[PDB]
Design a protein around this ligand. Structure first.
Ligand code: HEC
Ligand code: MSS
Lengths: 373, 81
């Protein structure tokens, strides 16, 4: 009818219908937070615009935009401040395109044990799309970045209902901002950005968690110091260690901002309790990382006692979902299926889930029980 | 003309309780965001979790909530959710 239950405690959610969107999993209404049903990820490598997940922090989201009047301001430690129209971006600068995953820092938080506070998401706070726009490098070079620059800040049209609440503003290092891959995207899957995905312009930060991907982006500031805004200084912090993790119940001793994705993979064509025919069972799914390249996906039908190599689909780019397929002989009875990806720098997925106070960065080997008959 | 976007109606509500914190939460906890933020938190988290949530809203986000109301709200939440 109109609700679903996610597979964790207090998992009931309304199915909600927004303009331009198919029915999605409603987390919050004001501001909107919308999760993608898992089944969508079995429909193809690129997430359709009408299915793409939505995450916002502040209730004052823009609800009327005049695209002709819209301006992107570039200011701070630059030789020439710029005020750029959408027409300017499309006409005066080379276009670039990238197929890239956007995934929220807190994707899968609902599965973290012990449970932690925050957005109680299943795995649907991620999506893959073909972004087109201008490399930020090109716009910054036009402004003329000055020696001594350290960071670039990014702010959008949304704001707090109460002005004392800190504005949503994020920062990137200057070397990252000018790397050529960070993009001012005006197009998503060949169309103008859906409204809730940041119409008319957003930052795309390939291989970095979604918090950086500032939507409705209208203000870019080059600064000669580290940005100390709340959403960099206090929010979006991970343990400053290799595992980005702590002992359950324990605060980190030091933290750093969240940054690149860790390696993830999913089986998309089966879910818990699915029936399959005993014999050769066809499996398929996706894998992704921070852009180093998926080297392999191993698949198991006996809870990781033994692994079979999956065949990797032809790729769409190092920042995209990477498809994979495997055919496994399954004897009659119950089987715990797992998949596990590794990337070209040797990052992989832990067999046992780790923990951090914020519930960011989950990437445990996913297990799915099926019934072969 | 500009382009515009229409949101569906908000319907999220707090779980009624006889504790006075129910009305104080209705009066203080929907000013910035819908109460589905609260309704969807992990269940039976208890007193320390909800004490911390309320204090964060006040200290970090500047929710204008006085001390008596803050305790009423956290107590109602810990007992109800
Ligand atoms: C504006 C000053 C707020 C008031 C009034 C209240 N809260 Fe709030 N809350 C605010 C922000 C900026 C956020 C983060 C939004 C995001 O999407 O990240 C929240 C979030 C919450 C949550 C989710 C958990 C968390 O982020 O800590 C909960 C459970 C929550 N808020 C509860 C809550 C209660 C009980 C309030 C009455 C005291 C309340 N909020 C008021 C800002 C504001
Ligand atoms: N402007 C803005 N932007 C922005 C925001 C907000 O809030 N605001 N959010 C973030 C986040 S945080 Mo976590 O890390 S995820 C995320 C993302 C999402 O996207 P979409 O919604 O499009 O999907 O976004 C990004 N951007």
């Amino acid at each position: 009818a109109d609700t679903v239950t996610l597979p964790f405690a207090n998992g009931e959610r309304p199915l909600v219908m927004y303009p331009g969107k198919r029915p999605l999993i409603g987390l919050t209404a004001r501001p909107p937070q919308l999760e993608t049903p898992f089944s969508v990820f079995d429909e193809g490598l690129i997430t359709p615009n009408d299915a793409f997940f939505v995450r916002y922090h502040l209730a004052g989201i823009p609800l009327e935009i005049d695209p002709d009047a819209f301006r992107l301001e570039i200011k701070g430690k630059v030789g020439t401040p710029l005020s750029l129209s959408l027409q300017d971006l499309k006409n005066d600068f080379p276009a670039s395109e990238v197929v890239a995953v956007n995934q929220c820092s807190g994707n899968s938080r609902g599965f973290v044990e012990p449970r932690v506070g925050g957005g109680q998401l299943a795995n649907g706070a991620m999506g893959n799309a073909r972004w087109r726009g201008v490399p930020l490098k090109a716009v910054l070079e036009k402004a003329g970045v000055q020696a001594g620059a350290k960071q670039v800040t990014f702010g959008g049209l949304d704001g707090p209902v109460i002005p004392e609440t800190p504005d949503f503003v994020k920062a990137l290092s200057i070397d990252h901002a000018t790397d050529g891959e960070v993009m001012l995207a005006y197009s998503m899957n060949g169309a103008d950005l859906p409204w809730l995905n940041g119409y008319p312009l957003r930052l795309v930060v390939p291989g970095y968690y979604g918090t950086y991907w500032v939507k409705h982006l209208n203000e870019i500031t080059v600064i000669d110091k580290e940005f100390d805004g709340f959403w960099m200084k206090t929010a979006y912090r991970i343990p400053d260690n290799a595992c980005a993790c702590t002992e359950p119940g324990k605060a980190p001793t030091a933290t750093i901002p969240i940054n690149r994705f860790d390696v993830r993979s999913f089986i998309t064509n089966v879910e818990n309790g699915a029936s399959v025919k005993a014999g050769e069972v066809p499996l398929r799914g996706i894998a992704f990382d921070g852009g180093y390249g998926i080297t392999q996906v191993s698949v198991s039908a006996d809870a990781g006692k033994s692994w079979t190599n999956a065949t990797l689909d032809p790729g769409l780019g190092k920042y995209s979902f990477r498809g994979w397929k495997a055919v496994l002989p399954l004897t009659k009875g119950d089987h715990v299926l797992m998949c596990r990806a590794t990337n070209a720098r040797g990052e992989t997925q832990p067999m046992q889930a780790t923990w951090n106070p914020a519930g960011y960065m989950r990437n445990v080997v996913e297990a799915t029980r099926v019934i072969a008959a | 003309a500009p382009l515009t976007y229409e949101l569906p109606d908000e319907t999220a509500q707090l779980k009624p309780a006889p504790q006075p914190g129910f009305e104080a939460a209705q009066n203080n906890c929907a000013a910035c965001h819908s109460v589905d933020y609260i309704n969807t938190q992990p269940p039976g988290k208890g007193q320390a979790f909800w004490d911390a949530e309320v204090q964060k809203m006040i200290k970090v986000y500047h929710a204008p909530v006085d001390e008596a109301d803050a305790k009423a709200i956290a107590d109602y939440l810990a007992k109800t959710y």
